[PDB]
Amino acid sequence: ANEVIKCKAAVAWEAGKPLSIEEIEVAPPKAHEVRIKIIATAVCHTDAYTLSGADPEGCFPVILGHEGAGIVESVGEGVTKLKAGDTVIPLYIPQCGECKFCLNPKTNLCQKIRVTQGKGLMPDGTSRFTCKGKTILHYMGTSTFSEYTVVADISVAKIDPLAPLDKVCLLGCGISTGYGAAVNTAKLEPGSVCAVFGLGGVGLAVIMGCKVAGASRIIGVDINKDKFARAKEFGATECINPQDFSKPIQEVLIEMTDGGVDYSFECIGNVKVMRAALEACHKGWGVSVVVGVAASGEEIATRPFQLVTGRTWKGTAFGGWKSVESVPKLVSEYMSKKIKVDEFVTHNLSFDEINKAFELMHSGKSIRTVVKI
């Protein structure tokens, strides 16, 4: 029988405060739920955004984390596709395969459990986390900052049992998104001229995707020149710092590409840079893809003339990958050396030092920090 598990977890008691390593209780999985033992997890800007209290959708107390990889500890009633021991990756974008969205080839945004997930609850409307007598909320349907988490069965990707979990946990978000933005959303053709704004883990994954697709030019853009070396290693043909120019970055890109790039990607979350990314696109056929998540309230803008004269403005969520069916394949692409993963890991920490990952992220000195549970 599946019992209540007593384990450690990094709890976010309140907005604006660091995470606290607490002893918590994890209820057994109910019908169509899966309990997972998290082996490794990474931290992303989104976890920090929610933690800051700036996220109008954020609620506390809560167990954050959405970039993890683990092993199935037990499954609830009705679950047959998964079993104890399976190697998996929690998914914040599920795939029920039955809804209006899963049935449509043009999207990956399953809506089956979005309502409850937004409230930090399981599909049945309750939470499996408790701590010191209080209910602790789930986050993005994953809550990877715990030794053991419980997710909806449609929020799980079964992967290659040989994949090193302290590496593939990154496919839970950043890598997959940037890579998918290039090959799924933009679908850039061989020989394309591209520009990538923001050279963090996401931008690097975009560059990686542009190289896989055979781009002829990949121009990285970042105000932090320390990001350049790794950008080139990933495939950037050149990097520029908007701070070195006196004219708008879009004019610079237009100037160095004889009209503008074929595809641009904003991987920062700056509405002003998003406009520049669109305007840096070549007249007639340029396509700009928004990947960054802007603070709530912020709006993007430009003159309709930009679209009338040929440019297209797109966006992407988790690289457009239908999660459950795609993630296993991304793991296989990693195992076969088609895509990189290890190269995104810049720092490693133990669970007790989880807050240092947030510090490294804000010091701007890391791409991705993997936390060993």
Ligand X SMILES: CCCCCCCCCCCC(=O)O
Residues making contact with ligand NAD (CB under 6 A): 44-46, 173-174, 177, 197-203, 221-224, 227, 242, 267-270, 273, 291-293, 308, 316-318, 364
Residue with tokens 């690097």: 204
Residue 128 bears catalytic tag: no
Residue pointed to by tokens 């795609």:
326
Q: Figure out which of the listed residues 162, 246, 305, 363 binds a copy of itself, where binding follows CB under 8 A.
A: 305
CA distance 328 to 15: 34
Which of 203, 247, 241, 206 has its CA nearest to residue 225? 241
> Does the active-site annotation cover 131?
no
Contact residues for Zn ion, defined by CB under 5 A = 44, 67, 96, 99, 102, 110, 112, 173
Binding-site member from 6, 187, 225, 365 for K ion (CB under 5 A):
187
- Minimum separation from the CB atom of position 284 to ligand X (A): 8
Closest to Zn ion by CB, 60 or 101: 101
Q: Does 161 bind a copy of itself (CB under 8 A)?
A: no
Catalytic residue among 35, 50, 66, 142: 66
Which are the contacts of 97, defined by CB distance < 8 A and separation ≥ 6?
A: 103, 110, 154, 324
Answer yes or no: are the C-beta atoms of 319 and 178 closer than 8 Å: yes
Does 284 bind a copy of itself (CB under 8 A)? Our answer is: yes
Within 222-241, the residues that bind a copy of itself by CB under 8 A are none
- Closest approach, Cβ 174 to Zn ion, in A, equals 5
Residue 285 beta carbon to K ion: minimum distance, rounded to whole angstroms: 9
Does residue 96 have an active-site annotation? yes
Answer positive or negative: Cα dihedral of 208, 210, 211, 213: positive
| 66 flagged as catalytic | yes
Residue 74 interacts, among K ion, a copy of itself, ligand NAD, none and using kind-specific CB cut-offs from 5 to 8 Å, with: none
DSSP SS3 for 164? coil
Question: Residues 108-127: x/- map of binding to a copy of itself (CB under 8 A)?
Answer: -x------------------
Locus of tokens 């781009």: 215
Could you confirm whether 194 is annotated as catalytic? no
CA distance 6 to 316: 38
Known catalytic residue at 99: yes
For 59-137, strand residue ranges (E) read 67-75, 87-90, 129-131, 134-136
Query: Do 266 and 198 form a contact (C-beta atoms < 8 A)?
Result: yes
User: Among residues 15, 212, 293, 335, which is the contact residue for a copy of itself, using CB under 8 A?
Assistant: 293
Quote the CA–CA distance of 86 and 17 in Å, as a whole number.
35
Q: Which SS3 state, helix, strand or coil, does residue 195 take?
A: strand
Interaction between residue 329 and K ion (CB under 5 A): no
What b/e sequence results for 203-220 when a residue is b if at least 16 CB atoms lie within 10 Å of its CB, and e otherwise? bbbbbbbbbbbebebbbb
Contact, 57 vs 118, CB < 8 A?
yes
**Which residue of 15, 59, 317, 349 would you call a contact of ligand X, by CB under 6 A?**
317
Residue 184 DSSP class: I
Which residue in the set 157, 231, 271, 360 belongs to the binding site for a copy of itself (CB under 8 A)? 271
Q: Which parts of this chain interact with ligand X (CB under 6 A)?
A: 44, 46, 66, 109, 111, 114, 173, 293, 308-309, 317
User: What are the residue numbers of the active site?
Assistant: 44-46, 66-67, 96, 99, 102, 110, 114, 173, 368
Q: Which parts of this chain interact with a copy of itself (CB under 8 A)?
A: 100-101, 104, 106-107, 109, 259, 271, 274, 283-285, 290-294, 297-317
